[PDB]
Structures are given as C-alpha cells and as structure tokens.
Amino acid sequence: KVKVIGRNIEMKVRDILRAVGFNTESAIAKVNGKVVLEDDEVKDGDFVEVIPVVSGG
C-alpha cells in the first residue's frame, strides 16, 4: 500500500516515510489521494503515495 513515485515502486505518516527511506523534509506524502502531514494518523486500509522532493545542485 506504499507507492514511491519517480522510481514508481509499489501509526502516523512519519513512520511510513522512514520505513521506505525518507523523512518529512525529503518527501511529501498523500493518503487515499490527499496530502497529509507527518504525524497524521494512518489507517489500515488506506493508499499512500510517497513523492521524493527533487533536489540537487
């Protein structure tokens, strides 16, 4: 239930981000198609997309 876009590979949202390799500052998340903040509660049957923040130099 965790899709990270960019590579396109398939509790609160802060842990699901750290579980897939990101934090609040390096990715933005949306649950069931809706943006959510870091300590927003995640439910058992919801669909999450992790959007890595594009960065470089």
Partner: protein
C-alpha cells in the same frame, strides 16, 4: 533513454530565465517517451546559487496536473551558475530518486543532458532541438 527531443522555444525560454537568475532554477519536462511537450518551472525553496530543492507543494501540483493531461515526466531540468552543465555528486542522489533525463544548463547558454542507468552510472544523452 538515449536522446532528448525538446522544442526550441522551451529551451530558449529556460536559458533566458537562467541567464538573469541569481539562484539555481529547476523544473519538470513533461511529454511522451523522450519528447518534451510541456515545461513547468518550480520554485527553488533553497533560494540558492549552489543548490536546489523543489517546493513540495508546487511539485505535487505540477505532477498531478501533468497526470490529468496524460503526460509523463520526461525529465528534470536545473541550472548551474558559473560552471559547466555536468552532473555533480549532489545531482547523482536526486537522479536515483527521479531516474529520468536530467537537463543541465548554465547562465552562459550551455546545456547538456544526462541519464542514470540501473547500474547507477551516468551517461550523456544527445539533444535534438525541435
């Protein structure tokens, strides 16, 4: 991919915006396969001449908009200031998370495009200006 096809008026506009910016510019190249059909500039929230990070809200709105239009992200573009358009080690990590074509330009009008393979090796890609 192997080659980037980008319309001249988009490339010229990117170079003009870069030529007068004191900070790094960044954005998306949207289209089909290797061909650019739309461009979206995105705020560099670091406001910095040496690094860039996309505003997350602007980024997400741009990707959702492109999805509605049935467009893929063909590539990412950003600028260097006072150095050649070669990927840096900082670019390497962003290319892992967004493994599409990376177009790099600078304020002198130079531009080159790059891609990161699955073996995490960078290769230059040819550009056709349409």
């Amino acid at each position: 991919m192997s080659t980037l096809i980008i319309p001249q008026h988009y490339l010229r506009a990117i170079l003009k915006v870069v030529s007068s910016s004191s900070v790094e510019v960044c954005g998306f190249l949207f289209g089909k396969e290797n061909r650019v059909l739309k461009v979206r500039f995105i705020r560099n929230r670091l406001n910095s001449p040496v690094e860039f990070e996309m505003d997350p809200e602007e980024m997400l709105k741009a990707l959702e908009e492109a999805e509605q239009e049935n467009l893929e992200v063909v590539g990412i573009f950003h600028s260097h200031i006072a150095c050649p358009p070669i990927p840096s080690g900082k670019d390497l990590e962003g290319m892992k998370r967004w493994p599409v074509i990376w177009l790099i330009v600078n304020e002198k009008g130079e531009y080159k495009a790059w891609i990161l393979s699955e073996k995490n090796k960078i290769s230059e890609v040819k550009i056709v200006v349409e």
